[PDB]
């Protein structure tokens, strides 16, 4: 449905940046997680990046790893995640929803079958953390066949040949890991700066650097990690953070 294409179009007309928060599905629990996500959206999140708990997350930071443990402890499973995803899409028809996956969970019951399921629940993009552009062929081909945008990470130590690949293979948005001109030169999908984004000034700096927006995960998860015993205060603090970060993109 080109939710990413539509979002960036509207954002550019309002000369604003995008603010995309990241959270682990089912953390700290299915019920509380769904409420967290609705608070993030109501607060002003332009898009969502959602992770599915995996047993061995290589490129997962410490704060993110604890989120997975809380999810697993709650009894969260990939099957339950897709149930949540369908529920989220049913309440929010236009917000772009991107998944942060690990290769085995996608390859498990068939690559093509996984992306078929994403398209069925309404997912817009999928970023396979442990699948480099050199091994992406089957994943991005299957993603495109099911109208799912294959997202690629552009590292800081990336050369020109990688920039071209990421620009050619990527769709939806380019995950810029904390160069924007070169990406636009190769007509890459709108860049979103991620990693380290936890303050309002960073979001403005990103938009001023030439990026279409910024992604924030650790900061978001940390608020959850420090209010487990107070669900209400959790949502309250999440709303404030998100509201401030989004205000910086305007």
């Amino acid at each position: 449905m080109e939710r990413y294409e539509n979002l960036f179009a509207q954002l550019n007309d309002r000369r604003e940046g995008a603010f995309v928060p990241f959270v682990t599905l089912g953390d700290p629990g299915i019920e509380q997680s769904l409420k967290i996500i609705d608070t993030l959206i109501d607060a002003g999140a332009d898009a969502l990046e959602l992770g599915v708990p995996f047993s061995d997350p290589l490129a997962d930071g410490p704060t993110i790893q604890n989120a997975n443990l809380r999810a697993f402890a709650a009894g969260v499973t990939p099957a339950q995640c897709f149930e949540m995803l369908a529920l989220i899409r049913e309440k929010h028809p236009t917000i772009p929803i991107g998944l942060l996956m690990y290769a085995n969970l996608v390859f498990n019951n068939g690559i093509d079958a996984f992306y078929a399921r994403c398209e069925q629940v309404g997912v817009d993009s999928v970023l396979v953390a442990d699948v480099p552009v050199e091994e992406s062929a089957p994943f991005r081909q299957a993603a495109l066949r099911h109208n799912i945008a294959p997202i690629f990470i552009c590292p800081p130590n990336a050369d020109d040949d990688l920039l071209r690949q990421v620009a050619s293979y990527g769709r939806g948005y380019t995950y810029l890991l904390s160069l924007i001109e070169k990406l636009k030169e190769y007509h890459a999908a709108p860049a979103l700066q991620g990693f380290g984004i936890s303050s309002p000034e960073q979001v403005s700096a990103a938009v001023r650097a030439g990026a279409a927006g910024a992604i924030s995960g650790s900061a978001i998860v940390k608020i959850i990690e420090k209010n487990l015993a107070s669900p209400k205060q959790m949502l309250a603090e999440l709303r404030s953070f998100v509201s401030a970060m989004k205000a910086a993109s305007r």
């Binding site: 490129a59 442990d130 480099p132 091994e135 990470i153 130590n157």
Partner: peptide
């Protein structure tokens, strides 16, 4: 086989 690692580790 293959090299299924984050992009940042390819170099």
């Amino acid at each position: 086989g293959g090299m299924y690692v984050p992009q940042i580790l390819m170099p």
